[PDB]
Design a protein around this ligand. Sequence first.
Ligand SMILES: Nc1ncnc2c1ncn2[C@@H]1O[C@H](COP(=O)(O)OP(=O)(O)OP(=O)(O)O)[C@@H](O)[C@H]1O
Ligand SMILES: Nc1ncnc2c1ncn2[C@@H]1O[C@H](COP(=O)(O)OP(=O)(O)OP(=O)(O)O)[C@@H](O)[C@H]1O
Ligand SMILES: [Ca+2]
Ligand SMILES: [Ca+2]
Lengths: 398, 163, 339, 369
Amino acid sequence: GRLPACVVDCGTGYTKLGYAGNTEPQFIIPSCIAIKEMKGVDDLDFFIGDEAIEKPTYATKWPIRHGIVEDWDLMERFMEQVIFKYLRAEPEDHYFLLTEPPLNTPENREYTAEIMFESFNVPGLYIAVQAVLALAASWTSRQVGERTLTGTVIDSGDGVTHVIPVAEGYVIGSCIKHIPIAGRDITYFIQQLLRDREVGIPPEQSLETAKAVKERYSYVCPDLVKEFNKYDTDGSKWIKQYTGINAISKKEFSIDVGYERFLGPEIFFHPEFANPDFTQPISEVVDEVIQNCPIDVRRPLYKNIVLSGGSTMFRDFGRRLQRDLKRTVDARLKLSEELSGPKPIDVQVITHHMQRYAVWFGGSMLASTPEFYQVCHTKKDYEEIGPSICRHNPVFGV
Amino acid sequence: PAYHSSDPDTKLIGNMALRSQFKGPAPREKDTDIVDEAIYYFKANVFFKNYEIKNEADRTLIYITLYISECLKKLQKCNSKSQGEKEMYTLGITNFPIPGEPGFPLNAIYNKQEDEVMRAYLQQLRQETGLRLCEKVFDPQNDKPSKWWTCFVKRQFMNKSLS
Amino acid sequence: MAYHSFLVEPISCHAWNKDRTQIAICPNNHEVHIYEKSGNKWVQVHELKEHNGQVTGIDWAPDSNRIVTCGTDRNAYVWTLKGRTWKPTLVILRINRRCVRWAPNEKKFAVGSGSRVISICYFEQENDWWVCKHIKKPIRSTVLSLDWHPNSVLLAAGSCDFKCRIFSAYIKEVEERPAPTPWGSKMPFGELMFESSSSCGWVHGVCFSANGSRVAWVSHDSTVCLADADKKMAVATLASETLPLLAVTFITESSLVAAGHDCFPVLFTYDSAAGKLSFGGRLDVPAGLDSLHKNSVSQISVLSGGKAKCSQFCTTGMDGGMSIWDVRSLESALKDLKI
Amino acid sequence: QGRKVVVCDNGTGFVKCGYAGSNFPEHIFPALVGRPIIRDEASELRSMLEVNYPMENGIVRNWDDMKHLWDYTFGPEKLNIDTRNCKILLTEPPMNPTKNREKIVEVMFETYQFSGVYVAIQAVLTLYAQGLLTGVVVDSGDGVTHICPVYEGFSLPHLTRRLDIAGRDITRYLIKLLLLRGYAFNHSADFETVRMIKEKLCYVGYNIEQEQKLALETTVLVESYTLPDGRIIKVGGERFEAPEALFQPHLINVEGVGVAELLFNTIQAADIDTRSEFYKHIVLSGGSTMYPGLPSRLERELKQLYLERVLKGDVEKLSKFKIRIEDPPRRKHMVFLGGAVLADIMKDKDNFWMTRQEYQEKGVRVLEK
Ligand SMILES: Nc1ncnc2c1ncn2[C@@H]1O[C@H](COP(=O)(O)OP(=O)(O)OP(=O)(O)O)[C@@H](O)[C@H]1O
Ligand SMILES: Nc1ncnc2c1ncn2[C@@H]1O[C@H](COP(=O)(O)OP(=O)(O)OP(=O)(O)O)[C@@H](O)[C@H]1O
Ligand SMILES: [Ca+2]
Ligand SMILES: [Ca+2]
């Protein structure tokens, strides 16, 4: 009505919270909560966000595993501190739009509804799909010409990278494919590479340093021969230097960043590098996902390829993706046209401006519309009918 | 995908026969060579585990690479360029692996004269690889082995090894 | 005292072969399994997946070597052995709605069901097809347990109508006439020859004697009632302190054994002198259960010996255990048990 | 002697062919012509194949597909027999156009050049297996649920009604219903999957109020089921509410009163000397007649509509009304067996069957009807 609702997307590696309508998140915290190693207000002594990553008197726990919730009570306390300590907004005087995973169970949605409605007494509640809002965030790259709920969305994060086909707001579970290489695995690959390449780095800061390498200098290349020959022949303009501070001695520690910057980002285009139990490249995964779905919507899925999540913000990822996809596509088209005794298959990998946090952007764009007040399940309907009132979320905005 | 090897009338010995000063069953060698070609894509295929055979030359490239792995693993403890060259001669003189003998980890993939020619070509190839790598491995500063080349000391190509 | 762990779920029906060489059973499934005995261990040999629901009744004609089965599939299957495969034949039951047993004549079978009509069925060789005539006179509920008499012309059945009636399913086109019985002279298809006086409890159990003189039944009012036509159709009931019995069969002409919700096979003897039933006691004396089966008994057939002198009693229950009993070992164990 | 007679039922979605006399069908294949676009034989591969149906709602749309369908039905896959040296018997749907019936024999005499042909009414053939002359044959397949009234071997075309709710519509109802329950399925990708789930756990309840009560209150109607992807869903009341559209066609936005209301309004709309006869003999044949609990609901609603309108409140005068419907055990394909019986009976009976010479001499409409 007069005030604004709150939006909160809980990811595996990072939780994004803020107010709907805003340009960016009001607080983008870490997906971890502090706990004790019980009666009274023992549950009130809970710290969440970045202020829990390195607690020493408490224990740092992780709740959101691979997009799905593992321990409910912990996530409850986390949402508590997210509501009161981080947002500090009146819950009874505000609505809320929560995000779900691609493989979110119905019973899980029911439980989330219970925790949000019974304990918080929220005036509004809406459980949305990630890819649904993602395609909408991708509809904020292309203006008004082609803003549709049809397309194939690939959401890569710290926990799990997935390829989910979306059609008119309705996802096709039978076509959805799961990928093994996630942001944490690329970060880990960088950690091992840096562990094998140079020394003089404290073990208590190794992982963070690796993450830094994945953040600042990491970039995906086109070929695996030239990115190494340019480092072997030149190596004066390519090889970068990284300087950090050892938290232990407060001294300036230094390392050399090079081939790893290409390798880590290359781990997606080739999963065979760091996984013996995975041989499929992302191109093949997307191809099979588009092919194992309805044929009538296949062209639309191949047309609107939307990148969502943080692990897809790496440079020139979608370029190589679209390259391989269009390559295989043109190849198959030629093979089909050689034995034909076919129209041009258009393929486009979209790169949104907020492709890092698209799941939350789409939610903020959905919650800003008047329809979100009509679509969101009311507290009244929740108390009158039951939890089943939050079991099916309507899709509008088209 | 993975990398492969780039004549119509070319002699062959067994399942796999393509410029060095070491004696062997090797023919005269153009500007680029099989050793140079193998050294070109050495740092890349090492991380790759899966690979497909497209030409007989690919087997030779795989052999040169698998030899380069042990060569670098031995060059890891080098302290001088001359020491690296000598160790290269020692590696070239070594004979511990053979096609379908006591385990080449790829005996499923790959006469007396043929065996002799194969062994001679193997010694010549190993010597050529060691000699060629011995110069590029050491840096101009402090005559020591470079870390950017000793980085692939732990990684194994095609999840197999000669040692 | 020989219990064999076959499955974890309950058992529906227990059937045996002619020479008792093979045993057939269903595990509350859309299919029926047939297992044999090769040494100390048992192994499955045949499997029939013709029925389209949970199998309720199954009986094997010994001399005919042919097993008929009928359950929730609202159909009957007169299965006969064809070479190395048991071929089933769909015998139309003609019912708009849990029991089956071949006659001693092994020519026609009674199918008592929830259609409140004991559907007798004979095989017409003129049309090469099975026909099922339905006896529904004086029937108000389903036919829990159905057992024949030695006459093979008069059938007995307990109903959910709190009574165990003994009617006649005699088809005069499949056999010769029936001799005069002590249960009456007028024997016609559909004619009610006998009935119970109980107004409480369901008659889950019902079985006639070997002499055909007495017909007994077990009611779900924790009471068992045996009737004797030798004393002008006298009815003798008895209340058991234990729970209700589910299956009832006679071991001797004056000694019957039965189990049920009590989950323990019990023995009893009825003195013809005084004209009353007496309790023999617990023949099954030893999870947390004080008996072999961890649930209620569901069926109890005879292995060998007849209903006058059973040498071995076969017991199937809801425990998933095949309970093989012997009268000799039971008499050698309980010395205070008079048969 | 008659060079092997046969019987073929070419329905909307499922084609069932069998030899004459067979108590069942000797081959049952899905009716779909499949084509490739890249460089039960077709149903296996449908995710990457363009599938088309020749027989739409009973009628043939694409003859170019129907011809190949016939060549695949008489091919070496299911029948494996020469059309020029064997007779056949086809099944037709009620209220069919004369043009369709003519074109059928025309294509069966010219394209296939069969030496023998014998068409019959499916509404008549369905009762023929039951051995009756007067009865109500109600067919509910994948195309449409047509209710046909038969009497003395004939069907009144002015008495044959039809409800636009079929097995396909049951599938769509189940797939739509599951979506609201919390799960998610595709409209085209998991079509057959949803059809299977419905065929498995779904049903039709007698007391909608009491069934809704048992579903909402108790947790006994809820059953679980595993999908192809490995994941499992638990469906409860959706099992019955999905098929309930068969009784009340207002639950799927359709014009009509319901199969029970249609049958009842078509029963009282008959001769008063035949009203007590047609209400005691109703044959249930069709794929949608295998739903566990349809018979009881039909009997109950039929009892309602002849006690609120025929008895008009008179309770005592309700018992006199006869009520007997027979849900045969082989009701799943009574049309086929009924043919398999007829074709076995009139195998060599006189000469009451269309001949090739009579189709080559004169009269493509040589039909004694
Ligand atoms: N600047 C960057 N460029 C590329 N990748 C990054 C960058 N910063 C962080 N990442 C990677 O992105 C991952 C987190 O991505 P994201 O926020 O999409 O996942 P999430 O939403 O926290 O979890 P989920 O995807 O399960 O919901 C981290 O593992 C990190 O390694
Ligand atoms: N056990 C079942 N319960 C309910 N419906 C079923 C069952 N099995 C199959 N069906 C439905 O029956 C339909 C097909 O039935 P059937 O083959 O008898 O008719 P048809 O010949 O395909 O149609 P038509 O005769 O109208 O051309 C399918 O759509 C399917 O959904
Ligand atoms: Ca996410
Ligand atoms: Ca049909």
